[PDB]
Amino acid sequence: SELDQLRQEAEQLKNQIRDARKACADATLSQITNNIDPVGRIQMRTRRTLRGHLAKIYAMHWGTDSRLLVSASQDGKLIIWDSYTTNKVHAIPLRSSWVMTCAYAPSGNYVACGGLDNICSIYNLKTREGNVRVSRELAGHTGYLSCCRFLDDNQIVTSSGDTTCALWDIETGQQTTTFTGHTGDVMSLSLAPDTRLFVSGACDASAKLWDVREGMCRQTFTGHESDINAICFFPNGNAFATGSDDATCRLFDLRADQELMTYSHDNIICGITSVSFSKSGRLLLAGYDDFNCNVWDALKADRAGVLAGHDNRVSCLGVTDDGMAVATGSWDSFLKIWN
Amino acid sequence: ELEDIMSKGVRLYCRLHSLYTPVIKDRDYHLKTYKSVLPGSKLVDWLLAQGDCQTREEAVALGVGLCNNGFMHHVLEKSEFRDESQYFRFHADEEMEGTQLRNDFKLVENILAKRLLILPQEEDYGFDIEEKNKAVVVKSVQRGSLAEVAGLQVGRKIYSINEDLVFLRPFSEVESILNQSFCSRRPLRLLVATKAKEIIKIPDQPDTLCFQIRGAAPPYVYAVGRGSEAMAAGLCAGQCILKVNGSNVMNDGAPEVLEHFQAFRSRREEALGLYQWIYHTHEDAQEARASQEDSPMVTLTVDNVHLEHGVVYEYVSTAGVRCHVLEKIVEPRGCFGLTAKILEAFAANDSGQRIACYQEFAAQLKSRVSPPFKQAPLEPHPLCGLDFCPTNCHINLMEVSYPKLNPMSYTQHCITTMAAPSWKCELQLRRDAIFCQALVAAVCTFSEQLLAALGYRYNNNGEYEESSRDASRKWLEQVAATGVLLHCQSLLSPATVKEERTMLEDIWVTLSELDNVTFSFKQLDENYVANTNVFYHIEGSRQALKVIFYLDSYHFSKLPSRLEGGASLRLHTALFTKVLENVEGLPSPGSQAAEDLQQDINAQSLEKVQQYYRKLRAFYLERSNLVKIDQLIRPINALDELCRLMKSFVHPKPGAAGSVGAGLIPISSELCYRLGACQMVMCGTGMQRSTLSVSLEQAAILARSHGLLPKCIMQATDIMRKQGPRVEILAKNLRVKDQMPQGAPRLYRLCQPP
Amino acid sequence: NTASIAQARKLVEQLKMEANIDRIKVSKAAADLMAYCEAHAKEDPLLTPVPASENPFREKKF
């Protein structure tokens, strides 16, 4: 049968990819970085507590100026905070509730909300009237829109719940490219510092490194047993870490094409709802479901510290582009700015 | 008095914070502003104006009892309560605004689960557990057992067994709870960690298909054979199929899903395989019975229908003991089958211009259970079978467990949320539509409360160190002799919204016609239905109507002796309506008529409830006639105090009108919770106003009966409304124009963080 | 069935591209990541205790 013989050559391709990765497995990251000096204790304390949401916070995103941060409440308000003066710089009511993602453009001019209404709405900020208006309601997804990011003020990559992630252009309000390589509901994405490649992850434990210009999936990473909930790049763009519901963070490479290090403690059984890296990348910050945020040594896989400051689970975590502080927005309507 | 002061303190907090122009407004003392404070003179004057205490020494005695019982405190805390113009701040507002602080009412987990009612087999229940990764998962389930008939898969993290939260318990103690539950032979209700979308890799046997797949868009599992490899893989009945084998089939029919299997394309009409077919609903089971009277794997992802969204909180109680709460929102499993039975019963009564129409609607309701709840119809669609179901019907349960062989005191309180019964599209069809839309929610709330009672969980009187067993038993004989009372508080605004005004007129005539239905129980146990315990059967006419509840052997042996002989059981109704907002810009007579209609049906609900209270007094009088009176004097003065407050709310004397604000909504719920009543909460949409009333009534029941510390009553009623359940109802609806009521009182408003 | 044919064929070409790409060894990858952390170790105020007047969240006037 032709279908079964192409499936058999597909498993031939899978097995040759697997033994290629095992041939590339010359050592492990623990063996390479065993002799480095340990981090020890990361005693960051809550410096500010942004408290203005009436529901669960579901996403946050800093700005590239490392001062403003946008936050998406479950009830349907994007509050754009100053992390310095603890002041709501903007407050945006949304047309529908249950937004799971918000994105801050690197220029600072745009924010983007997305939820289970299958529409990524782009709100302009620096208008002449001063009011925040919805610029474009990017619609065309059928599933829930799960993680949106800005490449620049016209290109926005939106994961969705119909196993796709689409790159949209805003001025025409369309999909320039669609990325359909997943079988599960795509739960996260994270752009690289190169802003030309990004990893999206779904419920099928597959993290695809795509490529935004050519439009096809460059490579595919497995290793989890549950839904991958959050992905974040390393600060150089050469590696990325995923946090899934299997209580494991996994740092994969992009040039070694396989998993470099796992992060799990036996005390931790809770799923990871957010991950990000420090500015040096030495500290992998992971917001779990045990109401905490563990900061792991990303080269020795030791739990360097714990951040226990929330009454509900930590939906969104994020480090500034200057690496100064980490906003751990949680479901208890708090945004604690640890530093 | 001094022992009733906790009930009166929760009641006066609920009456002070639920009025429009607040008496607890922030006041400045010594050029230092104090937030959410109440002067003693204005509190005592408000008490004597309301009618709580008749004299000022009675009012200051109430106040000093409150300050010793922890409800309020002086803002400098150098003084006891006296009739002075000094400021006394409530502890709940002090903890919410954050003015040594320890948080008592916290949240311990958020869960998504599925209830699995398992009858006990001979050697054990049909499964055994283990501790894997510091939790409690199923070690194994025996094949063909009633556990896998219910749908227990290996490896699922189990949350509760018989409304006892085990995931915070040690493994030896949960194993002891299982074996004592088996040796006492309790039908095991349990909640396991079930995700929404399930990737089942079913085996494709080359001869016959061990499953039935019916439906149009999406298709669902119509049946699954007992002990099959389908049941071993995890395909339980009722699961709607979204994708098969990679191919998206949520828009595809049933042959487009069966054709992916190897045995169906070998033999099409005859590939069932002679199995013990369990089904999804009892109507599907009886229709199927009346009709019949290496390894190629198929990996398909299905949607787990009838899931239960819960949040477990915990708190230190009043008397020191740590206590746990599980709040679940549950779509009623017998919703569509119930309205289908009502529509075919109305067709049988009519049998002609609508009989074929009604049976076609019943066929449309048995055809699919996709959503599985009727969302608010966006389009003015033509007359379907769907718009006879209760729109956005949900059941909010708290199962609360606190320690006192392992002594625990479980309880289970049901509060039914629903959008008001609408007909957005002759008038007899309209009245039958709203009648069915109300009666389905009535039968579902009474079913949840009845199985909670027969499982020995219900306790309307938990104030009095009364265990749930005897409290549920006295509720059973109480509801048997007196009848069942449906308290359904409407939160809609007839003065503001035209469609809500006609909704309230329609539900008023619907309850004036629905109070002659009777719930006559019966025993008929059928094992090849997946999880349901009660099976309904609606017989009768439009005017008089009987609903027959078929129960299991345990839940019929625990039933009171009067209704076991097929005796009738009338349902009386009560419609306490109150607008959650005030009225700014006082309106025309065209809205004063709506306000007078709201007051009229609130008065009729008050007279029906005091009729039921007089009958309840007569029943307790005859029970005491044939220790008991000295134990029953304590609930009866509290409940007629609540009746006096209800009469003050409904019919105030001329001179002080409107000064109570919107305090009917907590106090009517307290009164019909002290009284044995099925408590539905309805509004126009189902999400925001209804979860405000649900959060307040639930925190009031925990602070009243189960001894939640009054420092945490506002903390509980806002944690449950922001970061608890009943946000998934907004998730699943998401296409309505509902917003939170802005001009709502401080109790029925979300507290901004300090 | 033709949709299954097209899905299976696009999976075939996708995995042959993912097999045709090249990959560096994990020792060189770990050396690159350790070199990046060792190069940016002083420029990270979450790892390194930055002074209170220097970080904008303790004592800086901004």
Numbering used by the authors:
A (entry chain B): 2 to 340
B (entry chain A): 506 to 604, 610 to 803, 838 to 895, 931 to 983, 1012 to 1032, 1318 to 1518, 1527 to 1654
C (entry chain G): 5 to 66
From the study:
Phosphatidylinositol 3,4,5-trisphosphate (PIP3)–dependent Rac exchanger 1 (P-Rex1) plays key roles in neutrophil function and breast, prostate, and skin cancer metastasis (1–6) by activating small guanosine triphosphatases (GTPases) in response to extracellular signals. This 1659–amino acid Rho guanine nucleotide exchange factor (RhoGEF) is activated downstream of G protein–coupled receptors and phosphoinositide-3-kinase via heterotrimeric G protein βγ (Gβγ) subunits and PIP3, respectively. The N-terminal half of the enzyme contains signaling domains with well-known folds, including the Dbl homology (DH) and pleckstrin homology (PH) domains characteristic of the Dbl family of RhoGEFs, two DEP domains, and two PDZ domains. However, the structure and function of its C-terminal half are poorly understood, and it contains a large amount of low-complexity sequence. This region displays weak sequence homology to inositol polyphosphate-4-phosphatase type I (IP4P) in that it has a canonical phosphatase CX5R active site signature motif close to the C terminus.
We used single-particle cryo-EM to determine the structure of nearly full-length human P-Rex1 in complex with Gβγ to 3.2 Å resolution. We overcame this by collecting and merging together 0° and 30° tilted cryo-EM data to analyze ~900,000 particles and achieve a final structure with an overall resolution of 3.2 Å. Because the ~800-residue C-terminal IP4P domain of P-Rex1 had an unknown structure, we built it ab initio. The DEP2, PDZ1, and PDZ2 domains bury extensive surface area with the larger IP4P domain. Gβγ docks primarily with the IP4P domain but also makes contacts with both PDZ domains. The linker between DEP2 and PDZ1 forms the first strand of the core sheet (β1), fixing the position of these domains with respect to the IP4P domain. The domain is decorated with large loops, including a 285-residue insertion between β5 and αC that is disordered in our structure. Comparison of the P-Rex1 IP4P domain with the crystal structure of SidF bound to a substrate, PI(3,4)P2, suggests that P-Rex1 retains an intact phosphatase catalytic triad consisting of Cys1583, Arg1589, and Asp1638, although the final residue is found on the TI loop rather than on the P loop as in SidF. Therefore, in the P-Rex1 IP4P domain, a structural element within a canonical phosphatase active site has been repurposed to form a Gβγ-binding site. The P-Rex1 binding surface on Gβγ overlaps extensively with that used to bind Gα subunits and other G protein effectors.
